[PDB]
């Protein structure tokens, strides 16, 4: 009963990232099923998933290989532990993950969410230095507006003042450079690394684009310059590819970068979201043997990483990821998305001419369109104006689901998006921006 | 394949809570499938899952309703967002969760792991008081040896010195009473609540037993007196039932307690592990409307809880839980386990006679058996001696999988354990303790 579902949703669920007073007043999408690149609501209406269910869905909502891998695994066993035991799917997947990532990344620690992968990276980096005999390395370096998740460790190293600023008494402190967007901003970051090296246990950045800040790319050369500064100063470099990993930027991983490979950076890579093709929560933290080796010794020396929740390496999670990686290989996904990305960027250029479009930016299939009140001033709409949501409302009427962040329209379409869907998406966005009350 | 699986396991996976030096030297259980209460390894050998795959498995490894619920949901859709949208399974499950928990707990915020549920509880409690206009409530009260998970927020409020003590520079600070194990100890805790009330955003405890500390029960009346003290002193009380929820202690939830119900405590309840019957990572944080309502307002007031990772409310996770709750209701689980728990406790009594058993304690199906070098002194075995693992080795020869914590043998059997399996288990433990080098 559709009216009951709507009522129960508003009565019983406290939704993530949502002002519930407004959600309870509106007619919200309630999804019942999915086919291809489309979410289907309880009214039977179809919406193109233009943000990939928040940046995780790679191949659509009815991809048979991943669905069948889950069902086949559930007929064997859904979960048994990695605490002092092993399980088959987690072993096969760990080999695949080591093999598809840079050669210096050789060890796999599993978790469920990108934020937990980052918490684990933080704890490994911190404890590495303690075990290695370093003293006083209790701080970190990151960037303003960076985002790594919403638990306390993730929030500490993030720079998301709006989301996490209220929690400052609970966060551990470090240093934040100005948003990365050679350039004055690289120089600023190198200077911070050089100044604070001996007091810091890591530098952490996202994989070449700041997602939650509104899909802003790091300038070319930026991550490579930071990595080299980390190497020159004996600081661990953590790259968070929770959103960028698995093809979204046009490469398999941002860190598939000859210069980073040459530097053997990052020392720690976090993965999540698209790892399972979007169907289940798995994440991974991959490290160098150098980091792993510090935690080796006799049991009674108490040097092991005392971390790991219940469902670490769960077989259903790992079965979805195995199927995902198998798709990558068998369908030559990275080569096959190249004409689609090229078409997407070509189809976005006309948005630049609209009166309320300040900036069109991003990398591959991760794009933001920044709305502005005045093109020449660059002046923003007030937060309370919900300019991006005004655009989202118009897109919904044209059969497209888009979630913005503040003034930034976000497009993170599935790798499976068709050329026709791309052309439709950008033509609909053009009209939507014109129809919105801006 | 078997030798390669073993090699890849040791080569590529950094296992949770495991000294990898030692794991790489040993022959470790690699699980391939499950049937009923038994894990089946890649050699085809069967092991009774006497710890329920680390305290999550409720009904065995081949429970058709849960497996079928997962498969049926995967044919509709595996995942769409709860960020500003809804999905059907999460709605049906949220109503069921509200309905089966105490009546003052009316709202459901989903996550993947119990540690995240506790981080969310922390953040809700903290931000509640900021929004309500209170100043300086930045500390918490908990207990020494308590355990809430391994992310930074969970570690801060936990009291697990061995696991998390090295991370102290990254943890936010508070007050820890002495382990609840007795009126003297309740009075100590109440006094701390009275003393620090206006500077504290929560008191957090486990649901009636301290798991990771070695299955030590809180005395009867302890939780009730703390809850009453929280009510009388205007402090939020968070109860972590991640391990105790869904029948393990003999009741559906520890907080199904007439006194706690009358006090309308706890204010926030954390659930996880057995929620999905042990098959997938789902967790939930349930709260009162009082807490939820502080976060209501207009969008531009920015009062919403800016928390929620990608896979919040995932349909596969929620489908497993729906099936789980349905089993509870349709098979009258809580009434049916009562003679089995009584049998279990009766069959453990003989262990008390053995030379190296210091203590047999627990609640329902959560039991610890504390090993000691001298029964007269109660002196422990050194950490490095791994006395519990010595016992685990002998149990493994008898077709039983048990994971200890230091000197404590842990038994957390599935709710589906048969009377025959219970008698087998306790007789084998009796012999295993005798055979071990203690
Ligand atoms: Mg590699
Ligand atoms: Mg055209
Ligand atoms: Mg309730």
From Swiss-Prot, chains A, B:
User: What GO cellular component entries does it have?
Assistant: cytoplasm
Pfam families xref list = Aminotran_3
Q: Where in the cell is it found?
A: Cytoplasm
Its lineage opens with: Archaea, Methanobacteriati, Methanobacteriota, Methanomada group, Methanococci
| Similarity comment | Belongs to the class-III pyridoxal-phosphate-dependent aminotransferase family. BioA subfamily.
Q: Give the EC class as a word.
A: transferase
Q: What does this protein do?
A: Catalyzes the transfer of the alpha-amino group from S-adenosyl-L-methionine (SAM) to 7-keto-8-aminopelargonic acid (KAPA) to form 7,8-diaminopelargonic acid (DAPA). It is the only aminotransferase known to utilize SAM as an amino donor.
Name this protein carries in UniProt: Adenosylmethionine-8-amino-7-oxononanoate aminotransferase
Species source reads Methanocaldococcus jannaschii (strain ATCC 43067 / DSM 2661 / JAL-1 / JCM 10045 / NBRC 100440)
Q: What is its main location?
A: cytoplasm
Molecular function GO labels: adenosylmethionine-8-amino-7-oxononanoate transaminase activity; pyridoxal phosphate binding
Pathway in which the depicted protein is active: Cofactor biosynthesis; biotin biosynthesis; 7,8-diaminononanoate from 8-amino-7-oxononanoate (SAM route): step 1/1
Q: Where is this site: Participates in the substrate recognition with KAPA and in a stacking interaction with the adenine ring of SAM?
A: 17
**Residue positions binding pyridoxal 5'-phosphate:** 114-115, 240
In short, the EC number is 2.6.1.62
- Per its Swiss-Prot or TrEMBL entry, what cofactor is needed? pyridoxal 5'-phosphate
């Amino acid at each position: 009963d559709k009216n009951l579902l709507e009522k129960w949703d508003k009565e019983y669920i406290w939704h993530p990232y949502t002002q519930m007073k407004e959600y309870r007043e509106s007619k919200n999408l309630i999804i019942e099923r999915g086919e291809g690149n489309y979410l289907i609501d309880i009214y039977g209406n179809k919406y193109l998933d233009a943000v990939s269910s928040i940046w995780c869905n790679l191949f659509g909502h009815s991809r048979k290989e991943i669905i069948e891998a889950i069902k086949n695994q559930a007929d064997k066993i859904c979960h048994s532990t990695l605490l002092g035991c092993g399980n088959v799917p987690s072993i096969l997947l760990a080999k695949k993950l080591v093999d598809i990532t840079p050669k210096h990344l050789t060890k796999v620690f599993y978790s469920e969410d990108g934020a937990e992968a980052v918490e684990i990276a933080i704890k490994m980096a911190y404890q590495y230095y303690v075990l290695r005999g370093d003293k006083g390395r209790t701080k970190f370096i990151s960037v303003k507006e960076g985002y790594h998740g919403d638990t306390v460790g993730a929030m500490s190293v993030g720079g998301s003042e709006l989301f996490h600023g209220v929690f400052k008494p609970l966060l551990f402190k470090g240093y934040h450079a100005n948003p990365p967007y050679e350039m004055e901003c690289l120089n600023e970051m190198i200077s911070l690394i050089e100044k604070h090296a001996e007091e810091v246990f890591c530098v952490i950045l996202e994989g070449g684009i700041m997602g939650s800040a509104g899909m802003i790319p790091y300038p070319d050369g930026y991550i490579e310059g930071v990595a080299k500064a980390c190497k020159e100063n004996d600081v661990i470099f953590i790259l968070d590819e929770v959103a960028t990993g698995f093809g979204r930027t046009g490469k398999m991983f941002f860190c598939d970068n000859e210069e980073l490979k040459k530097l053997e950076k990052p020392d720690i890579l976090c993965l999540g979201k698209g790892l399972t093709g979007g169907y289940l929560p798995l994440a991974a933290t991959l490290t160098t043997d150098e980091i792993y080796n510090q935690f080796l010794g006799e049991f009674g020396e108490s040097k092991q990483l005392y971390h790991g929740h219940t469902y670490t390496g769960n077989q259903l999670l790992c079965s979805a990821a195995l199927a995902t990686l198998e798709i990558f290989e068998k369908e030559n996904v990275i080569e096959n998305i190249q004409p689609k990305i090229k078409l997407f960027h070509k189809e976005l250029r006309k948005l630049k001419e609209l009166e309320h479009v300040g900036d069109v930016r991003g990398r591959g299939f991760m794009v933001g369109i920044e709305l502005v009140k005045d093109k020449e001033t660059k002046e923003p709409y007030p937060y309370g104006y919900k300019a991006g949501y005004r655009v989202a409302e118009k897109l919904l009427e044209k059969g497209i689901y888009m979630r913005p962040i503040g003034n930034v329209i976000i497009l993170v379409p599935p790798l499976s998006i068709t050329e026709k869907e791309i052309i439709y998406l950008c033509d609909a966005l053009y009209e939507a921006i014109k129809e919105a009350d801006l």
